[PDB]
UniProtKB/Swiss-Prot annotation, chains A, B:
InterPro entries: Thymidate_synth/dCMP_Mease, Thymidate_synth/dCMP_Mease_dom, Thymidate_synth/dCMP_Mease_sf, Thymidylate_synthase, Thymidylate_synthase_AS. (6R)-5,10-methylene-5,6,7,8-tetrahydrofolate binds at residues 51, 169, 263. Belongs to the thymidylate synthase family. Bacterial-type ThyA subfamily. GO terms for biological process: dTMP biosynthetic process; dTTP biosynthetic process; methylation; regulation of translation; response to radiation. This is Thymidylate synthase. Although not discussed in the published references, Met-1 is represented in the submitted PDB entries as being modified by either a formyl, or a carboxyl group. The N-terminal is probably N-(dihydroxymethyl)methionine, the hydrated form of N-formylmethionine. Catalyzes the reductive methylation of 2'-deoxyuridine-5'-monophosphate (dUMP) to 2'-deoxythymidine-5'-monophosphate (dTMP) while utilizing 5,10-methylenetetrahydrofolate (mTHF) as the methyl donor and reductant in the reaction, yielding dihydrofolate (DHF) as a by-product. This enzymatic reaction provides an intracellular de novo source of dTMP, an essential precursor for DNA biosynthesis. This protein also binds to its mRNA thus repressing its own translation.
Amino acid sequence: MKQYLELMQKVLDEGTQKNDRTGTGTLSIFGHQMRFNLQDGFPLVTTKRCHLRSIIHELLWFLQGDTNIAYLHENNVTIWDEWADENGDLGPVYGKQWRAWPTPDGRHIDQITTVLNQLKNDPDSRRIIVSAWNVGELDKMALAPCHAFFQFYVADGKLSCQLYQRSCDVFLGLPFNIASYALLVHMMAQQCDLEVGDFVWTGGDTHLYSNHMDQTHLQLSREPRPLPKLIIKRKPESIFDYRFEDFEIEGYDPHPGIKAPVAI
Amino acid sequence: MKQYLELMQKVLDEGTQKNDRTGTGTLSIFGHQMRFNLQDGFPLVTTKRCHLRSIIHELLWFLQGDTNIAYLHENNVTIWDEWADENGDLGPVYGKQWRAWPTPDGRHIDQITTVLNQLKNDPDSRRIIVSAWNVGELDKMALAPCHAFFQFYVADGKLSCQLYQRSCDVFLGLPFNIASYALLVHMMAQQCDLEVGDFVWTGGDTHLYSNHMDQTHLQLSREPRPLPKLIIKRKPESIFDYRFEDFEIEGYDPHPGIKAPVAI
Ligand SMILES: O=c1ccn([C@H]2C[C@H](O)[C@@H](COP(=O)(O)O)O2)c(=O)[nH]1
Ligand SMILES: O=c1ccn([C@H]2C[C@H](O)[C@@H](COP(=O)(O)O)O2)c(=O)[nH]1
């Protein structure tokens, strides 16, 4: 993806050496913004094969407010195994904050529903936000939310969304983070009878791990292919009624996948 | 300011018509990022005279976790009068969330102190964040926080900060929002024995009110003057011990002030 490869080069050319949690060094930049016109095509990286399968299950898992990996396991999705405790619990992460943000007075706020209500009744609102950054529950989470905060925006019948990502592994995580939110935008837009607009990605500490240099150079030598198209087979009655089989991506012809190891 | 005037032109050239809360129309863009190297000078708009006096008092007021306008009044600062109730209370706004974010279990989190601790003990952290977006208390606030979320970053002994502003009145509010956080960066940096780095401003719904066109065109015709320098007369023992008289801006030679009316 043109915008993506440009970020990779930027991290290489301008990133400063910075170490992560008792481990691998990284090349790091702070503050970056990218824009994807969703009307131009689904922003799924083509310079390396990316599998949407786990992304879709993860998103549907987030929407159900589920915080135990059982659902992911019923579908053989193991991306959260690394963090789940013996019982399969991850703590009050994403799904829990999105659907049941606990208040000091005993309530549980459903931010997804609130946002649906706003887009349908007050589209011009500058307060259509979903936050997963719950300060009071951070100590209980398996890990602090990376995509911590996102805001919606409506203009000319088009729904845009801006995500603020505090930390970002450009090589391994970013291709997935973009596809995940771009999917959510299509789902929201469908439910609110709006066209898709832009997906604006904003990152904090954007980096490349030192042991991923060869993979980065390899990917950078590749030429981006046309973006595929996302197809939603049917329109569910609510944002909580989507099923894995409802989505299909058409015209995705990527370059070979590239593995990237992580230190432990 | 070069980056500022460029944003104004952008809103004019590319902004779409969008109305605000039962009132004035605006020219609006969604998603914008600006960077200010604080080493180049204090980012205080020179194309129109801006008064720092109220900005400083407001910041010191935020730091004390104060949420009643009494302190502002002792100093004849009336920027919050519009929202204060009969008693002078604004609800659990900025100051309250920064210094005493209430948890469901009865605790009150001091995010300013937590952030100081991190910059001093874990500078490489990608989780040095302060959020004022407390979902559970939004209904009690005089207004939902505009500068809702900011993150710190340390690299090569330089402290950078990125602010996410959900809504932004480019003409009236932005010059002030930038100076406010740029001051905070200098204060934090001083307390942690670090040099100042960049101030990255990220905005959501960035706009210009329709009844401010003449003022915008007037300002756009002006040429930016050199940036002033911020001087901190002394180093307090803590971030909570700063006083109005501790700051002085040197070399500020702006163009005449420009008034901008608001509809009611
Ligand atoms: O959605 C996600 C989750 C994690 N990461 C990456 C960011 C960092 O490389 C590491 C998390 O480290 P900390 O930010 O907590 O330090 O995993 C992503 O890129 N995207
Ligand atoms: O720090 C601030 C606070 C407010 N505003 C502006 C943004 C909007 O123009 C209006 C607030 O409206 P809502 O975002 O709630 O709709 O005041 C700013 O520019 N900066």
